[PDB]
Design a protein around this ligand. Structure first.
Ligand code: HEM
Ligand code: HEM
Ligand SMILES: CC(C)(C)OC(=O)N[C@H](CS[C@H](Cc1ccccc1)C(=O)NCCCc1cccnc1)Cc1cccc2ccccc12
Ligand SMILES: CC(C)(C)OC(=O)N[C@H](CS[C@H](Cc1ccccc1)C(=O)NCCCc1cccnc1)Cc1cccc2ccccc12
Lengths: 457, 445
């Protein structure tokens, strides 16, 4: 199968036997995708072992894969295992089981169900400040993901279930301590390597009850959801799963935990990591931070409480969040498995090929963005948003399988940014790694953690 | 009793004695609420005779009335009589009777019972195309609500009872269309609303607003006819045989009149916006190639079709207003509302507010796109109401209408007919309808 892209006349790096091109990942997915886009142009192919991966960068073709031909051709992502009972998780589900679950979990993030969560998040916004004030009253660096990680946990545990689990901290909370080591795709680990480079050992590992999420983490979270599921008010992610489990049919008990673990993860890890990138950029661009602070005070004078409506009114904040996501799309890539032979936009694609959208590369392509390395929130002004293509800039994906928690993620991060910049300013402190080095490993994180100085206003 | 809104400091137009403000309805309910929305902003109160009506536009206040404090304070709509045996209908009943019926008829539109009706509807979707093709191969302008109203009668008499009858001169469509005619210049509907203190005179006199021998053509037909009918006989074996017919009168009128009128409102906008009709015709051929028959699932995938239906129902909300009767003194969202006031949600005026809609008069299905769907408050756009007393057939109507719209744009395109009223003039009468009947030229593909 290593002669596939030569057959189709599609350029790409020459693959080694067995390994394919995975050796080229020594700088990470992101540097590999940039170089290949520069070397080969609009379309190229490579192999993750024996798995052909076709990378597409054309906006029309991307819309076909992500939106037009989703339900019929590009329905699922690259198979990820061994996962055990977590195969029922929405992000991992396939075909009919995914359609069932997506529809069932959509009503969790309506503008009505979101509006109902601002007062709940309004509790832990003030808590995030009080923990910040302590580290501010005394000259000392502040690791942001710890304090952002704590905030995220409280926000996902109470809006989806109704359970306050972090009493002002309580910094050694078992939820965060177990959830951070939930999945760490270390490519140096022979495990995630051999899974990718020889993706036929999953069935063995599955019958051996081996899982990519450690057992004590899955157990602790599994015990807790059974401890949370009693419910004997407001309809929440726990209620939407329980009212329909009580009523084809239906939602299982090991399935109801699976969706909770997915939500519990993304709510904690994705939110806190993007919040760190933002604050790093504001601290390294004081003009942008002052301008954002100037906007927050105009919309919310006297440190007014942020509301659902006032969050959406702030134009510069939305630009700051978007430009950061442009530079740091935490998904790095978007993938879809081609389930049958298709010829999209005049290009034949055979069954079984994974179609990959190099999001990180597209977000930094000079042919789409001026000075793509520079942090310029003005790209996303309404004056300039004409020249921004929704299929080049896809930080939450696109189409029927985009980020289901997008609106929740943006509001939770915006509510956090408002109540923080309302009370503090952020300066570098030399131990701040400048410029920021990105983790040359699997997921999108920095090398050294983000540490900043916090001053009170 | 006319100095109420003056006491509470709530703005409003001055009431004439006995009449109140009902002389401003000469332009219809819709134009009155919009005039009031501009002059008296946010909240105002007027009078329907001796009946004070508080019009609220704040979406949080709308949510309190429609959802939060529904079961408690705002359970019942405005009193409507004389009704007779029709007092037992779900839309007219109150409190306890409403609760037992709202739960009883809710299983009619579960995701299961609603998927059972797809092969029942898919038969009449070919008689509609075969009847339009006789008037399309000939260059004859088609009156849309006629051929539509026929399709709406079959679907409701076969998804609720299981009897195939309609489709031309059908006795059901004939008696159903004249079931109620709220002409506001008829001295009947005017007075009993303005001077309602004579309603119980007509109630003890066995008088009713619905025609006697129109209620009889439908009272004996149900005695003649798992679906909607079956779901009620199983609980009957305290549902009486009089309250049973009351519900069939509701489902048949709604399933016929409400479906046909909106579909005509849809077809009018698609003809006036060819770039919208063509863009919708290209989406139906992609999810359903070779004119593939539409199923339950292929309907929910079509996004533009939903954004067209939602933009029409924004423009033409056939209910115009939502109403709840405040049953005790309350102070909701920082405002005293006494007992007996009718709280009114001006659905038509809200669906065209420039504060919530840009270029509202213009038809743009792009307001409901997933990118712009975020900007839509679910208490400003409430074409089916909201809360525990919303439209029970909303999920049924949203599917049934979309089932009709798909089987038509696969075979025919629609152009104006010169005699088509452009722009469409709304009926300055009572209900929401066009003045002249909608007519369009039908060209086959
Ligand atoms: C800054 C924060 C976040 C970003 C940038 C982000 C990004 C993404 C991306 C790129 C995808 C895949 C889209 C595609 O394949 O086209 C996705 C999917 C998903 N996201 Fe997020 N996400 C964030 C936070 C969250 C949160 C807070 C939740 C809470 C539940 C969440 C839940 C999910 C789920 C369940 C999926 C799977 C979608 C499916 O398969 O149906 N994400 N997200
Ligand atoms: C486009 C079509 C339709 C629209 C826009 C519509 C609109 C509405 C509205 C606004 C309400 C009142 C909500 C409130 O007061 O808060 C309602 C209630 C109701 N609708 Fe519909 N309707 C439609 C079609 C139908 C259909 C097809 C049926 C079939 C049976 C139906 C049966 C009912 C009934 C029985 C009620 C009263 C329920 C109650 O009072 O508890 N409607 N509808
Ligand atoms: C096969 C490869 C790897 C090539 O690809 C994929 O199939 N891996 C993902 C499916 S395994 C992952 C299971 C998990 C659970 C708990 C903690 C860690 C991992 C998941 O389900 N994670 C999505 C749910 C949470 C989330 C994360 C980020 C943003 N929002 C929500 C598919 C996938 C889904 C959604 C977003 C993704 C972003 C980046 C990479 C993959 C993504
Ligand atoms: C007191 C006023 C008038 C100010 O107000 C109300 O109380 N009148 C309605 C209750 S009398 C009406 C009885 C009827 C039956 C057969 C044919 C004509 C009339 C009804 O039951 N009609 C609802 C049932 C069908 C339907 C219609 C439209 C949309 N969906 C379903 C209350 C009411 C209920 C539901 C929807 C309404 C829409 C517009 C106006 C009133 C509505």
């Amino acid at each position: 199968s290593h002669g596939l892209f030569k057959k189709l006349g599609i350029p790409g790096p020459t693959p080694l036997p067995f390994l394919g091109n995975i050796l080229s990942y020594h700088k990470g997915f992101c540097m590999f995708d940039m170089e290949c886009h520069k070397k080969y142009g609009k379309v190229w192919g490579f192999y993750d072992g024996q798995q052909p991966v076709l990378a597409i960068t054309d906006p029309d073709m991307i819309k076909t894969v992500l939106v037009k031909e989703c339900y019929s051709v590009f329905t699922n992502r690259r198979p990820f295992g061994p996962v055990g009972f977590m195969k029922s998780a929405i992000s991992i589900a396939e075909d009919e089981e995914w359609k069932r679950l997506r529809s069932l979990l959509s009503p969790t993030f309506t503008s009505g169900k979101l509006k109902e969560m601002v007062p709940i998040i309004a509790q832990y916004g003030d808590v995030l400040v009080r923990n910040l004030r302590r580290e501010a009253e005394t000259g000392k660096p502040v690791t942001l993901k710890d304090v952002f990680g704590a905030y995220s946990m409280d926000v996902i545990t109470s809006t989806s279930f109704g359970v306050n689990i972090d009493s002002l901290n309580n910094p050694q909370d078992p939820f965060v301590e177990n959830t951070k080591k939930l999945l760490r795709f270390d490519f140096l680990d022979p495990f995630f390597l051999s899974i990718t480079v020889f993706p036929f050992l999953i069935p063995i590992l599955e019958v051996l009850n081996i899982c990519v999420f450690p057992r004590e983490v899955t157990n602790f979270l599994r015990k807790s959801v059974k401890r949370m599921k009693e419910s004997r008010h407001r309809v929440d992610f726990l209620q939407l799963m329980i009212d329909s489990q009580n009523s084809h049919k239906a939602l299982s008990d090991l399935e109801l935990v699976a969706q909770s673990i997915i939500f519990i993860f993304a709510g904690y890890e994705t939110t806190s990591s993007v919040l760190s990138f933002i604050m790093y950029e504001l601290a390294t661009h004081p003009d942008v931070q002052q301008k954002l602070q100037e906007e927050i005070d105009a919309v919310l004078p006297n440190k007014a409480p942020p509301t659902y409506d006032t969050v959406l009114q702030m134009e510069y904040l939305d630009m700051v969040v978007n430009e950061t996501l442009r530079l740091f799309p935490i998904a790095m890539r978007l993938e879809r498995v081609c389930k049958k032979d298709v010829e999209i936009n005049g290009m034949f694609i055979p069954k079984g090929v994974v179609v990959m959208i190099p999001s990180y590369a597209l977000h930094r392509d000079p042919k789409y963005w001026t000075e793509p390395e520079k942090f310029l929130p003005e790209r996303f002004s309404k004056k300039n948003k004409d020249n921004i293509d929704p299929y080049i800039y896809t930080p939450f994906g696109s189409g029927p399988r985009n980020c289901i928690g997008m609106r929740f993620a943006l509001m939770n991060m915006k509510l956090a940014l408002i109540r923080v910049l309302q009370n503090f300013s952020f300066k570098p402190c030399k131990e701040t790694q400048i410029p920021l080095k990105l983790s040359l490993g699997g997921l999108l994180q920095p090398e050294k953690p983000v540490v900043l100085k916090v001053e009170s206003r």
